[PDB]
Amino acid sequence: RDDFHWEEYLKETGSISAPSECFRQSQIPPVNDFKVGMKLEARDPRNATSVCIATVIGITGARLRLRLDGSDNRNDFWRLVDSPDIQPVGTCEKEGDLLQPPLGYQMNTSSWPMFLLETLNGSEMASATLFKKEPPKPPLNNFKVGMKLEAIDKKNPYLICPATIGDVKGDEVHITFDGWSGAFDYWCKYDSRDIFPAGWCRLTGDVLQPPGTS
Numbered sequence: 001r002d003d004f005h006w007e008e009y010l011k012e013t014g015s016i017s018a019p020s021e022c023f024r025q026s027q028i029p030p031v032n033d034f035k036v037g038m039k040l041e042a043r044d045p046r047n048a049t050s051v052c053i054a055t056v057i058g059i060t061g062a063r064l065r066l067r068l069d070g071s072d073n074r075n076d077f078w079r080l081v082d083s084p085d086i087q088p089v090g091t092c093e094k095e096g097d098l099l100q101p102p103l104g105y106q107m108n109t110s111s112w113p114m115f116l117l118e119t120l121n122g123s124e125m126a127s128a129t130l131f132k133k134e135p136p137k138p139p140l141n142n143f144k145v146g147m148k149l150e151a152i153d154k155k156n157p158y159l160i161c162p163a164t165i166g167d168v169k170g171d172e173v174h175i176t177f178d179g180w181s182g183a184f185d186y187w188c189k190y191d192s193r194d195i196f197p198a199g200w201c202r203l204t205g206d207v208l209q210p211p212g213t214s
């Protein structure tokens with residue numbers, strides 16, 4: 001929403017936003033120089049032990065909409081340019097591993113070797129320079145109940161929404177989405193890369209969803 005401005009929203013709701021130091025997100029957001037069509041390696045979101053070739057389908061703020069080469073277009077996922085889950089082509093090999101076909105590979109398994117060559121042939125492989133350094137983990141869990149922040153809706157990952165810490169337990173926090181039912185609530189580690197300080201979308205040029213209408 002064009003009207004949503006944190007300073008005003010905080011005033012209105014009589015709330016405070018979690019300080020930037022609570023998050024495992026860089027004080028100065030990483031720069032996103034990726035381009036649509038670039039190739040990179042990404043851990044298969046539906047098969048963690050696999051590293052696959054991914055193509056940048058879209059760009060949004062400091063995030064990349066990715067699709068695993070050879071799979072359908074219904075399992076796209078979003079990753080920060082400083083996410084540990086993505087890396088330049090060639091990394092997998094250097095960490096003693098082999099690239100695998102995606103879980104949703106649409107061709108026969110035996111076709112993988114030639115498909116890999118074909119999909120990378122004359123393609124634009126994102127340079128190591130585009131991959132940013134992950135922020136260090138905040139030493140402690142400094143989140144307090146009631147603090148507001150921006151969080152990814154894990155049921156609809158493209159969405160970053162105004163959220164509130166509903167609970168704190170050990171190194172985890174209970175995320176609740178403002179204006180929506182508990183149907184989208186979830187627990188995550190306080191250093192999750194899926195939560196961000198108020199103002200993140202504004203600084204990175206990403207899309208912050210407007211609060212819901214509860």
Ligand SMILES: CNCCCC[C@H](N)C(=O)O
Nearest residue numbers: 153156159161177180184
């Ligand atoms: C907390 N964000 C929730 C978004 C829900 C969007 C979905 N299309 C629906 O209307 O259910």
